[PDB]
Amino acid sequence: FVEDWDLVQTLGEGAYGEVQLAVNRVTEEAVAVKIVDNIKKEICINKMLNHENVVKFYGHRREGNIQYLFLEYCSGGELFDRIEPDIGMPEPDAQRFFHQLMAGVVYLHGIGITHRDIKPENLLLDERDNLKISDFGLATVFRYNNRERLLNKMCGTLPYVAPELLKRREFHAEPVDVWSCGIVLTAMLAGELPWDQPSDSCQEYSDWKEKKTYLNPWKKIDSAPLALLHKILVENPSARITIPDIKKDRWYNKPLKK
């Protein structure tokens, strides 16, 4: 009876379908079942993945039109629900989550995979509050046989997308994921998103380029994390800080405690 799973509740909703909690009849092990009525690519990319900061993939099954993906149930839920609106979270918690996010992103980039939709809704927490990158539906290969391929498709979520995606025909994948991580860090530290989108027409984006850090959400952020944000949220993706450099940042290396 070890192959029998009971559907307990609906965890969340996606565009394709639902994410349901399934519990094994014999072992009581929990799995998050992603139901999709491309999907072939999400499966292929998931089979590649093996990291402590990436949602585990257990397998998949196709029944008629319906496709089931068996994924890690992260009982701590979304990082999204740990961010208090207009407040954020304690700086040592945000730093620990950021460290984990960098470890997961380094891993993906290392294997030539770009997530392309990093946001707090996609960053799940296990039973010990360990961050796991989730949903590879928008993910793609940006490096293969040691040759980088430039991206051109418009995707992600506007508050989190890098400005080059809106202005350039082609762009490097890695600075785009770095930028979205910066936005996630801003959200964790201020409990708000800095702009609707990083465009010339967006007043809040213009204010940031004009270094008006006396305005929210920047005024809520301590100078050390803010100095890192200055490095990440750089309009030119070629001048933007790289992850190896982020790991050398003063705040990234600052010992913090409750």
Ligand SMILES: COC(=O)c1cnc(Nc2cnc(C#N)cn2)cc1NC[C@H]1CNCCO1
């Ligand atoms: C209290 O535990 C939860 O809420 C919860 C746990 N584990 C999940 N696991 C996975 C794993 N992989 C994928 C993919 N793709 C999706 N959800 C999902 C969960 N909630 C569903 C949310 C997740 N954020 C997007 C919207 O629905």
